[PDB]
Design a protein around this motif. Structure first.
Motif, mmCIF file in Angstrom:
data_model
loop_
_atom_site.group_PDB
_atom_site.id
_atom_site.type_symbol
_atom_site.label_atom_id
_atom_site.label_comp_id
_atom_site.label_asym_id
_atom_site.label_seq_id
_atom_site.Cartn_x
_atom_site.Cartn_y
_atom_site.Cartn_z
ATOM 1 N N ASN A 324 6.766 10.356 -36.208
ATOM 2 C CA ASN A 324 7.908 11.186 -36.621
ATOM 3 C C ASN A 324 8.537 11.921 -35.434
ATOM 4 N N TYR A 325 7.898 11.855 -34.251
ATOM 5 C CA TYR A 325 8.349 12.548 -33.039
ATOM 6 C C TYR A 325 8.688 11.604 -31.885
ATOM 7 N N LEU A 326 7.964 10.479 -31.796
ATOM 8 C CA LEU A 326 8.076 9.512 -30.704
ATOM 9 C C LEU A 326 8.587 8.169 -31.198
ATOM 10 N N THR A 327 9.446 7.535 -30.387
ATOM 11 C CA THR A 327 10.046 6.230 -30.668
ATOM 12 C C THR A 327 8.997 5.112 -30.655
ATOM 13 N N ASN A 328 8.148 5.053 -29.606
ATOM 14 C CA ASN A 328 7.141 3.995 -29.518
ATOM 15 C C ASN A 328 5.708 4.525 -29.391
ATOM 16 N N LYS A 355 5.922 13.400 -19.428
ATOM 17 C CA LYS A 355 6.984 14.420 -19.490
ATOM 18 C C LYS A 355 7.921 14.216 -20.694
ATOM 19 N N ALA A 356 8.394 12.969 -20.914
ATOM 20 C CA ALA A 356 9.277 12.621 -22.033
ATOM 21 C C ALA A 356 8.533 12.758 -23.358
ATOM 22 N N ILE A 357 7.240 12.366 -23.385
ATOM 23 C CA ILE A 357 6.399 12.471 -24.584
ATOM 24 C C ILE A 357 6.210 13.949 -24.983
ATOM 25 N N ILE A 358 5.807 14.837 -24.029
ATOM 26 C CA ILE A 358 5.621 16.278 -24.298
ATOM 27 C C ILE A 358 6.910 16.911 -24.808
ATOM 28 N N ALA A 359 8.058 16.596 -24.172
ATOM 29 C CA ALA A 359 9.374 17.111 -24.579
ATOM 30 C C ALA A 359 9.659 16.801 -26.061
ATOM 31 N N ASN A 360 9.320 15.574 -26.506
ATOM 32 C CA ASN A 360 9.514 15.157 -27.892
ATOM 33 C C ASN A 360 8.509 15.766 -28.868
ATOM 34 N N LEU A 361 7.434 16.362 -28.344
ATOM 35 C CA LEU A 361 6.393 16.986 -29.159
ATOM 36 C C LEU A 361 6.473 18.514 -29.142
HETATM 37 C C1 LIG Z 1 12.558 11.403 -28.316
HETATM 38 O O1 LIG Z 1 13.271 11.550 -29.549
HETATM 39 C C2 LIG Z 1 14.598 10.986 -29.552
HETATM 40 C C3 LIG Z 1 15.188 11.289 -30.913
HETATM 41 O O2 LIG Z 1 15.347 12.687 -31.115
HETATM 42 C C4 LIG Z 1 14.549 9.490 -29.228
HETATM 43 O O3 LIG Z 1 15.872 8.992 -29.021
HETATM 44 C C5 LIG Z 1 16.476 8.133 -29.991
HETATM 45 O O4 LIG Z 1 15.982 6.792 -29.893
HETATM 46 C C6 LIG Z 1 16.576 5.873 -30.831
HETATM 47 C C7 LIG Z 1 15.873 4.547 -30.658
HETATM 48 O O5 LIG Z 1 14.677 4.495 -31.424
HETATM 49 C C8 LIG Z 1 18.086 5.798 -30.603
HETATM 50 O O6 LIG Z 1 18.679 4.955 -31.588
HETATM 51 C C9 LIG Z 1 18.701 7.191 -30.694
HETATM 52 O O7 LIG Z 1 20.080 7.134 -30.351
HETATM 53 C C10 LIG Z 1 17.988 8.168 -29.757
HETATM 54 N N1 LIG Z 1 18.485 9.520 -29.958
HETATM 55 C C11 LIG Z 1 18.916 10.317 -28.967
HETATM 56 C C12 LIG Z 1 19.375 11.684 -29.380
HETATM 57 O O8 LIG Z 1 18.931 9.954 -27.794
HETATM 58 C C13 LIG Z 1 13.749 9.240 -27.950
HETATM 59 O O9 LIG Z 1 13.561 7.842 -27.771
HETATM 60 C C14 LIG Z 1 12.378 9.915 -28.017
HETATM 61 N N2 LIG Z 1 11.650 9.715 -26.772
HETATM 62 C C15 LIG Z 1 10.370 9.315 -26.712
HETATM 63 C C16 LIG Z 1 9.775 9.230 -25.337
HETATM 64 O O10 LIG Z 1 9.720 9.039 -27.718
#
Ligand SMILES: *[C@@H]1O[C@H](CO)[C@@H](O[C@@H]2O[C@H](CO)[C@@H](O)[C@H](O)[C@H]2NC(C)=O)[C@H](O)[C@H]1NC(C)=O
Ligand SMILES: *[C@@H]1O[C@H](CO)[C@@H](O[C@@H]2O[C@H](CO)[C@@H](O[C@@H]3O[C@H](CO[C@H]4O[C@H](CO)[C@@H](O)[C@H](O[C@H]5O[C@H](CO)[C@@H](O)[C@H](O)[C@@H]5O[C@H]5O[C@H](CO)[C@@H](O)[C@H](O)[C@@H]5O)[C@@H]4O)[C@@H](O)[C@H](O)[C@@H]3O)[C@H](O)[C@H]2NC(C)=O)[C@H](O)[C@H]1NC(C)=O
Ligand SMILES: *[C@@H]1O[C@H](CO[C@@H]2O[C@@H](C)[C@@H](O)[C@@H](O)[C@@H]2O)[C@@H](O[C@@H]2O[C@H](CO)[C@@H](O[C@@H]3O[C@H](CO)[C@@H](O)[C@H](O[C@H]4O[C@H](CO)[C@@H](O)[C@H](O)[C@@H]4O)[C@@H]3O)[C@H](O)[C@H]2NC(C)=O)[C@H](O[C@@H]2O[C@@H](C)[C@@H](O)[C@@H](O)[C@@H]2O)[C@H]1NC(C)=O
Ligand SMILES: O=C(CCN1CCN(C(=O)OCc2cc(Cl)cc(Cl)c2)CC1)c1ccc2[nH]c(=O)oc2c1
Ligand SMILES: [Ca+2]
Ligand SMILES: [Ca+2]
Ligand SMILES: [Cl-]
Ligand SMILES: [K+]
Ligand code: NA
Ligand code: NA
Ligand SMILES: [Zn+2]
Ligand SMILES: [Zn+2]
Length: 785
Positions: A324-328, A355-361
């Motif tokens: 719910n916080y991270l893309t992959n 750094k990107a992971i912590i920011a999203n958490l």
């Molecule tokens: C951190 O979260 C953001 C969402 O808040 C992620 O960015 C999105 O990624 C999807 C692809 O799955 C894109 O379709 C969206 O346009 C992105 N949103 C924004 C606002 O850029 C981001 O990938 C996440 N980062 C990590 C490292 O998980």
């Protein structure tokens, strides 16, 4: 290969450790699949159960029986524990009055009281509230012996880290058992609760009690019981070993119970299904005490009834998902549950962006039930960072919650543990009963890291180097107290006089405009410096400091604020005042130019100008020797503490003595850094940047007495604040400091002992209190539960 066709006849639970190809008869044989074929039939006998009956009294001995009721059983040490109750009209131990044990009462051949460690898994401290109605034997041990209301476990509040901490007196980061599961990047192997990997010696560091014992010529019983060996058999085995001849008999024994942890996970700590497992553990304690009584050992042995950790109400529904916080989440490996440890799925992946992971958490949901931390940013009281097995990225989970990678990863459980070790539900039990423990005594809560030293003292052993403070638990004991010695000061201070003129300095600073110092501001004597260095004692009307010529700042700053002290503002024209100190050379001073040039670094003061006793005395607070480097984000925390909280504490505690200073721990080992380890300096300078700032706040335990006129015991609260360039840790930091600064400080609460390790300083050297009492004071942790 092992030849299992051998026999266990007359070898059941033998103390000699046998190895391949010989078949084993010791308790550990089951976990190595090396027991002789007849181990179950000869050693795990269950015939006629565990209790003597009237018709069995004076029976002809039958070797098939689980236990005996024959006239010879006492001399052989294998009676059923209730033999004398049923056959000789004796009373159960629990039914006897609580009688003081002034000296050990042992049979001939005993030279010291044996020690029995009765460990209970997942026994929450609050389970003791159920009292004698549920656990009469345990309640009698508790009320008759020495007890704490609770014992603090180590973090993570899990079994293997806590049991091994009990055995070694070490923090998990030092003993190496950092979790129930762990990945070692050097071994490229994973330790699990189930499987063979855990049996490899490479994981287990330090020196456990049984090794400390054997190395000093003291025999130990097993500290590992196979799940197939029933509790009644564990008790009978211990009683049999206690009946061995003097040259064979162990001095230390351990019992272990999987309960109440097992039912705790199934039903939760408040479940009505918890009553019967607690009654069952109490029955086991009763069998041990009756068994000891009939062998005339109930007033001989010291019994320690101890838990590894508590139990919290935790459910499947209360799970936070990283998806719910991270893309992959497929690119990461997560150690999940009551804590989170993250690392890339591929051990050394270059695309892994923590750094990107912590920011999203970080502060993404208003009621977020976890907080991310790089391990070096975790509260120092957890001592959870200095090990290659501890992943850089950590998640501190809120009590009652779980963290999982994704939803795919009725519920199997209703209870769990592993959370922050200050959490009430994680607190466990401690009871010491016997001749060496005190009689009907309550002691304050203490940490489980302290028990290894006590167990060594109870056995006449020299403890291996450990994280306990030897002598801090002397108040639990009648005898065998450790006589501690004050550490010798390594570096004597210089006492500089005026050696410079104002004109000798070119620091880029501007400013618009001894006596009784020691007596008033240094209430417990000068801290001693326990390492080789060059430092100066500087006296002022309102404060005293130990100024380091090496780090160009104080190691400590000491000052007393009375209940009646007035708080004043810094006049507008003195806002940027920094003054050269004519006792300290320009070469051993900081400079304002470095601070002006550094657009990310500001400065604070250790003694605050806000608390000056007069406008004239205020000028001393602006000395270059009282300044320290501080990020503007940190200054919001520091200024609120100095301008608001110090006066609050003085008003509520009837004056306070404050010792403040920097900490340098770049390699996060919990120990004072040497010069070569410092990795950040104020731009273009040799001014080192602290990783943390501490304060030790002491007052009179009897608050009707002012801090500067205290006749008895002291009261202390301390903290080790991370010196961070942002306030990302505090989700509400955009609000006024009155809404979040205190919450942050409470999270980073610390023991005086934590500060001593981090600074190489030794406090409270000159008091009217015993050294043992001061050691207890140094290990105290103010929790805000
Ligand atoms: C951190 O979260 C953001 C969402 O808040 C992620 O960015 C999105 O990624 C999807 C692809 O799955 C894109 O379709 C969206 O346009 C992105 N949103 C924004 C606002 O850029 C981001 O990938 C996440 N980062 C990590 C490292 O998980
Ligand atoms: C909590 O209490 C402990 C015990 O006193 C303190 O830890 C000790 O700190 C000192 C000073 O830094 C270390 O000494 C240095 O290291 C070596 C000697 O080290 C070797 O020999 C000792 C003794 O035989 C042995 O214990 C050491 O074991 C480490 O390595 C093992 C194999 O990898 C491993 O199984 C074991 O768990 C342990 O690892 C831990 O310590 C290392 C650092 O040694 C650390 O990197 C790791 O992450 C683990 O935390 C080792 O074989 C000397 O040559 C040097 O000169 C120097 O004196 C001790 O080694 C160390 N002892 C232990 C048991 O960790 C903690 O500082 C204290 N904490 C606080 C906050 O006060
Ligand atoms: C695995 O163990 C089996 C069980 O043996 C018992 O447990 C082992 C661990 C050990 O404690 C043994 O002492 C135990 O008996 C082995 O089977 C046994 O093998 C031995 C021979 O190695 C047999 O013995 C003989 O028994 C006779 C009585 O039945 C005795 O009369 C005889 O004594 C004569 O020989 C000796 C030796 O020269 C002289 O000193 C005497 O003076 C006398 O002249 C022996 O003692 C024993 O009977 C066997 N037990 C059973 C139940 O069969 C097993 O050994 C393997 O299998 C056996 C059947 C034989 O083929 C062995 O040669 C063979 O090695 C062990 N397995 C392995 C691979 O070693
Ligand atoms: O896997 C286990 C238990 C495995 N053993 C623990 C050690 N043990 C033993 O007898 O320890 C005795 C002992 C050893 C030491 Cl070092 C020190 C002392 Cl004071 C005493 C044998 C059983 C477990 C337990 C609770 C759990 N909760 C959970 O979620 O998973 C769990 C797994
Ligand atoms: Ca329920
Ligand atoms: Ca360090
Ligand atoms: Cl874990
Ligand atoms: K600056
Ligand atoms: Na075993
Ligand atoms: Na914030
Ligand atoms: Zn446990
Ligand atoms: Zn458990």
């Amino acid at each position: 290969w092992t030849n299992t066709s051998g026999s266990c006849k007359g070898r059941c639970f033998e103390l000699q450790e046998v190895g391949p190809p010989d078949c084993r008869c010791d308790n550990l044989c089951k976990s190595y699949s090396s027991c002789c074929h007849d181990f179950d039939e000869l050693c795990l006998k269950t015939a006629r159960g565990w209790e003597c009956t009237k018709d069995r009294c004076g029976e002809v001995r039958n070797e098939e029986n689980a236990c005996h009721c024959s006239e010879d059983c006492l001399s052989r040490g294998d009676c059923c524990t209730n033999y004398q109750v049923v056959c000789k009209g004796e009373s159960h131990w629990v039914d006897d009055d609580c009688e003081e044990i002034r000296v050990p009462e042992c049979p001939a051949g005993f030279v010291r009281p044996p020690l029995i460690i009765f460990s209970v898994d997942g026994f929450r401290a609050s389970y003791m509230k159920k009292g004698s109605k549920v656990m009469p034997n345990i309640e009698k041990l508790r009320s008759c012996g020495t007890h704490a209301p609770y014992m603090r476990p180590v973090y993570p509040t899990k079994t293997f880290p806590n049991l091994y901490t009990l055995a070694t007196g070490l923090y998990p980061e030092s003993h190496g058992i950092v979790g129930n599961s762990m990945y070692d990047p050097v071994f490229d192997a994973t330790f699990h609760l189930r499987g063979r990997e855990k049996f490899n010696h490479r994981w287990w560091g330090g020196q456990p009690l049984w090794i400390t014992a054997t190395k000093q010529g003291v025999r130990a019983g097993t500290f590992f019981w196979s799940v197939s060996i029933p509790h009644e058999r564990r008790i009978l085995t211990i009683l049999q070993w206690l009946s061995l001849p003097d040259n064979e008999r162990p001095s230390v024994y351990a019992f272990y119970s999987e309960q109440p942890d097992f039912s705790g996970h199934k039903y939760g700590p408040f479940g009505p299904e918890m009553t019967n497992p607690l009654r069952e553990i109490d029955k086991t304690v009763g069998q041990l005490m009756d068994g000891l009584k009939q062998l005339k050992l109930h007033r001989c042995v010291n019994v320690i009834f101890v838990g590894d950790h508590g139990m919290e109400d935790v459910t499947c529904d209360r799970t936070e998902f990283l998806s719910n916080y991270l893309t992959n989440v497929d690119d990461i490996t997560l150690v999940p549950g009551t804590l989170g440890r993250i690392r890339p799925k591929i051990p050394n992946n270059l695309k892994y962006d923590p750094k990107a992971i912590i920011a999203n958490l970080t502060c993404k949901k208003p009621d977020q039930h976890f907080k991310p931390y790089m391990k070096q940013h975790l509260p120092k009281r957890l001592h959870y960072a200095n090990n290659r097995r501890i992943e850089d990225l950590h998640l501190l989970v809120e009590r009652r919650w779980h963290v999982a990678r994704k939803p795919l990863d009725k519920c199997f459980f209703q209870g769990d543990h592993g959370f922050d070790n200050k959490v009430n539900s994680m607190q466990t039990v401690f009871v010491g009963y016997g001749p060496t423990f005190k009689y009907r005594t309550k002691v304050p809560p203490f940490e489980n890291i302290e028990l290894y030293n006590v167990m060594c003292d109870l056995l006449g052993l020299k403890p291996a180097p450990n994280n306990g403070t030897h002598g801090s638990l002397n108040h639990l004991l009648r005898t065998n107290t450790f006589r501690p010695t004050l550490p010798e000061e390594v570096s004597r201070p210089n006492y500089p006089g005026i050696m410079y003129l104002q004109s000798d300095f070119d620091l880029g600073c501007t400013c618009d405009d001894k006596g009784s110092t020691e007596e008033r501001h240094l209430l417990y004597g000068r801290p001693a410096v326990l390492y080789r260095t060059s430092y100066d004692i500087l006296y002022h009307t309102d404060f005293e400091s130990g100024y380091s010529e090496i780090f160009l700042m104080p190691l400590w700053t000491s000052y007393t604020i009375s209940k009646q002290a007035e708080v004043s503002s810094i006049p507008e024209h003195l806002t940027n005042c920094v003054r050269p100190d004519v006792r300290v050379s320009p070469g051993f001073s900081q400079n304002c130019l470095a601070y002006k040039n550094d657009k990310q670094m500001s400065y604070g003061f250790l003694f605050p100008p806000y608390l000056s006793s007069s406008p004239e005395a205020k000028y001393d607070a602006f000395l270059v020797t009282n300044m320290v480097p501080m990020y503007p984000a940190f200054k919001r925390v520091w200024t609120y503490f100095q301008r608001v909280l110090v006066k609050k504490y003085a008003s509520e505690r009837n004056g306070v003595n404050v010792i403040s200073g920097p900490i340098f721990d770049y390699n996060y080992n919990g120990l004072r850094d040497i010069e070569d380890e410092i990795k950040q300096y104020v731009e273009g300078s040799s001014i080192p940047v602290p990783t943390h700032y501490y304060s030790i706040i002491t007052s009179c335990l009897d608050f009707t007495q002012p801090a500067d006129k205290c006749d008895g015991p002291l009261s202390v609260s301390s903290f080790i604040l991370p010196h961070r360039p942002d306030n990302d840790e505090s989700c509400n930091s955009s609000e006024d400091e009155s809404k979040w600064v205190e919450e942050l400080m409470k999270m980073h609460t610390a023991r005086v002992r934590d500060i001593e390790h981090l600074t190489g300083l030794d406090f409270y050297r000159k008091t009217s209190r015993s050294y043992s009492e001061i050691l207890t004071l140094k290990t105290y942790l103010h929790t805000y539960e």
